[PDB]
Design an enzyme around this catalytic site. Structure first.
Site, PDB file in Angstrom:
ATOM      1  N   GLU A 209       0.847  -1.198   0.000  1.00  0.00           N
ATOM      2  CA  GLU A 209       0.000   0.000   0.000  1.00  0.00           C
ATOM      3  C   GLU A 209       0.888   1.255   0.000  1.00  0.00           C
ATOM      4  OE1 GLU A 209      -0.680   2.200   2.915  1.00  0.00           O
ATOM      5  OE2 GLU A 209      -1.638   3.446   1.378  1.00  0.00           O
TER       6      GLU A 209
ATOM      7  N   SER B 202      -5.751  -7.610  -1.408  1.00  0.00           N
ATOM      8  CA  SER B 202      -5.744  -8.986  -1.891  1.00  0.00           C
ATOM      9  C   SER B 202      -4.309  -9.428  -2.082  1.00  0.00           C
ATOM     10  CB  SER B 202      -6.502  -9.079  -3.218  1.00  0.00           C
ATOM     11  OG  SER B 202      -6.347 -10.365  -3.778  1.00  0.00           O
TER      12      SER B 202
ATOM     13  N   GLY C  69      -5.230  -9.865  -9.378  1.00  0.00           N
ATOM     14  CA  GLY C  69      -5.643  -9.970 -10.785  1.00  0.00           C
ATOM     15  C   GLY C  69      -6.611 -11.096 -11.080  1.00  0.00           C
TER      16      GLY C  69
ATOM     17  N   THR D  98     -12.465  -6.807  -6.361  1.00  0.00           N
ATOM     18  CA  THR D  98     -13.688  -6.340  -7.023  1.00  0.00           C
ATOM     19  C   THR D  98     -14.930  -7.001  -6.424  1.00  0.00           C
ATOM     20  OG1 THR D  98     -12.587  -5.836  -9.119  1.00  0.00           O
ATOM     21  CG2 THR D  98     -14.964  -6.242  -9.239  1.00  0.00           C
TER      22      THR D  98
HETATM   23  C1  LIG Z   1      -5.444  -2.911  -5.053  1.00  0.00           C
HETATM   24  C2  LIG Z   1      -5.693  -4.369  -4.768  1.00  0.00           C
HETATM   25  C3  LIG Z   1      -6.668  -4.507  -3.623  1.00  0.00           C
HETATM   26  C4  LIG Z   1      -6.325  -4.969  -6.005  1.00  0.00           C
HETATM   27  O1  LIG Z   1      -6.813  -6.241  -5.730  1.00  0.00           O
HETATM   28  P1  LIG Z   1      -6.970  -7.395  -6.795  1.00  0.00           P
HETATM   29  O2  LIG Z   1      -7.807  -8.493  -6.224  1.00  0.00           O
HETATM   30  O3  LIG Z   1      -5.873  -7.578  -7.704  1.00  0.00           O
HETATM   31  O4  LIG Z   1      -8.024  -6.583  -7.790  1.00  0.00           O
HETATM   32  P2  LIG Z   1      -9.046  -7.233  -8.839  1.00  0.00           P
HETATM   33  O5  LIG Z   1      -8.370  -8.323  -9.576  1.00  0.00           O
HETATM   34  O6  LIG Z   1     -10.459  -7.140  -8.467  1.00  0.00           O
HETATM   35  O7  LIG Z   1      -8.796  -6.185  -9.993  1.00  0.00           O
HETATM   36  C5  LIG Z   1      -9.390  -4.963  -9.970  1.00  0.00           C
HETATM   37  C6  LIG Z   1      -8.903  -4.098 -11.124  1.00  0.00           C
HETATM   38  O8  LIG Z   1      -7.617  -3.679 -10.909  1.00  0.00           O
HETATM   39  C7  LIG Z   1      -6.835  -4.003 -11.978  1.00  0.00           C
HETATM   40  N1  LIG Z   1      -5.531  -4.293 -11.455  1.00  0.00           N
HETATM   41  C8  LIG Z   1      -5.204  -5.145 -10.486  1.00  0.00           C
HETATM   42  N2  LIG Z   1      -3.930  -5.097 -10.246  1.00  0.00           N
HETATM   43  C9  LIG Z   1      -3.383  -4.196 -11.060  1.00  0.00           C
HETATM   44  C10 LIG Z   1      -2.112  -3.714 -11.280  1.00  0.00           C
HETATM   45  N3  LIG Z   1      -1.017  -4.206 -10.530  1.00  0.00           N
HETATM   46  N4  LIG Z   1      -1.910  -2.787 -12.164  1.00  0.00           N
HETATM   47  C11 LIG Z   1      -2.915  -2.308 -12.871  1.00  0.00           C
HETATM   48  N5  LIG Z   1      -4.154  -2.735 -12.705  1.00  0.00           N
HETATM   49  C12 LIG Z   1      -4.408  -3.666 -11.829  1.00  0.00           C
HETATM   50  C13 LIG Z   1      -7.500  -5.126 -12.658  1.00  0.00           C
HETATM   51  O9  LIG Z   1      -7.030  -5.301 -13.950  1.00  0.00           O
HETATM   52  C14 LIG Z   1      -8.935  -4.760 -12.473  1.00  0.00           C
HETATM   53  O10 LIG Z   1      -9.465  -3.933 -13.439  1.00  0.00           O
HETATM   54  P3  LIG Z   1     -10.434  -4.385 -14.594  1.00  0.00           P
HETATM   55  O11 LIG Z   1     -11.320  -5.473 -14.152  1.00  0.00           O
HETATM   56  O12 LIG Z   1     -11.201  -3.210 -15.039  1.00  0.00           O
HETATM   57  O13 LIG Z   1      -9.408  -4.824 -15.535  1.00  0.00           O
HETATM   58  C15 LIG Z   1      -4.322  -5.044  -4.493  1.00  0.00           C
HETATM   59  O14 LIG Z   1      -3.365  -4.720  -5.419  1.00  0.00           O
HETATM   60  C16 LIG Z   1      -3.758  -4.768  -3.090  1.00  0.00           C
HETATM   61  O15 LIG Z   1      -4.055  -5.435  -2.209  1.00  0.00           O
HETATM   62  N6  LIG Z   1      -2.784  -3.697  -2.910  1.00  0.00           N
HETATM   63  C17 LIG Z   1      -2.142  -3.362  -1.575  1.00  0.00           C
HETATM   64  C18 LIG Z   1      -3.367  -2.893  -1.010  1.00  0.00           C
HETATM   65  C19 LIG Z   1      -3.794  -1.507  -1.366  1.00  0.00           C
HETATM   66  O16 LIG Z   1      -3.071  -0.664  -1.745  1.00  0.00           O
HETATM   67  N7  LIG Z   1      -5.101  -1.312  -1.075  1.00  0.00           N
HETATM   68  C20 LIG Z   1      -5.771  -0.083  -1.313  1.00  0.00           C
HETATM   69  C21 LIG Z   1      -5.573   1.042  -0.399  1.00  0.00           C
HETATM   70  S1  LIG Z   1      -6.777   2.231  -0.943  1.00  0.00           S
END
Ligand SMILES: CC(C)(COP(=O)(O)OP(=O)(O)OC[C@H]1O[C@@H](n2cnc3c(N)ncnc32)[C@H](O)[C@@H]1OP(=O)(O)O)[C@@H](O)C(=O)NCCC(=O)NCCS
Length: 197
Positions: free
Chosen positions: A27, A117, A121, A126
């Protein structure tokens, strides 16, 4: 594969660890401040426990009941009165976030403290956000608020109908003479995002 569950009290220790580790690893603001899991757990374990205890939080778990993704939600009125384990390591974080507390809900609101998560991906975050939208409607919340620090979650929230009501640019932000968020390169702003149910 993974099962979507409502988080309950027996998951509290797992939930605290999951967000601590996930945020410290990935994060943007936690990384910028070089937080450890000790720092994060000290400051935020109270709010994380309350997110579980208020009954509106969700997770994906594997076959052995380990959390692989979760969303920690809490009623806004509980958030506004929250206590934290304040330490110098997280002071600039509270200072930054404090700016967004100026836009407040005029009716029942669910606040997203954390979404994350570890299996990325695959649509898990979501699905957790969509589940949260359903939960909010079912319990008569009028708004969902989140203070989103990551371009990825900002875009996810946007895709599900959230609107930005406030923002702070990371680059140049000061805490006294320090510039604690200048190291962030992935995301330009922290944003307070609001969905009207
Ligand atoms: C942000 C986070 C929660 C995404 O979770 P995740 O389960 O991969 O997300 P999902 O697969 O539902 O994907 C959601 C969207 O993000 C996109 N996405 C996921 N990872 C990505 C990446 N590294 N770069 C670009 N896009 C990304 C997906 O392509 C998707 O978009 P789409 O369906 O329109 O293509 C995850 O990266 C995380 O845990 N990060 C550390 C936590 C964080 O920063 N939380 C938020 C604080 S506000």
């Amino acid at each position: 594969m993974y099962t979507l569950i409502k988080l309950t009290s027996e998951y509290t220790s797992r939930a605290i660890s999951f967000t601590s580790r996930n945020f410290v690893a990935s994060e943007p603001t936690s990384i910028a401040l070089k937080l450890t899991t000790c720092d994060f757990t000290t400051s935020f374990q109270n709010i994380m426990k309350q997110c579980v205890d208020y009954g509106h939080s969700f997770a994906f778990v594997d076959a052995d009941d380990n959390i692989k993704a979760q969303i920690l939600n809490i009623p806004y009125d509980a958030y506004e009165n929250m206590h934290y384990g304040n330490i110098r390591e997280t002071d600039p974080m509270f200072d930054l976030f404090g700016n967004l507390d100026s836009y407040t809900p005029d009716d029942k609101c669910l606040y997203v403290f954390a979404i994350g998560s570890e299996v990325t991906g695959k649509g898990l975050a979501t699905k957790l956000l969509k589940k949260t939208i359903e939960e909010s409607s079912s319990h008569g919340f009028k708004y969902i608020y989140g203070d989103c620090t990551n371009i990825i979650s900002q875009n996810m929230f946007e895709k599900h109908g959230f609107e930005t009501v406030g923002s702070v640019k990371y680059k140049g932000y000061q805490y006294g003479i320090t510039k604690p968020f200048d190291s962030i390169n992935c995301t330009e702003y922290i944003k307070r995002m609001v969905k009207t149910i």
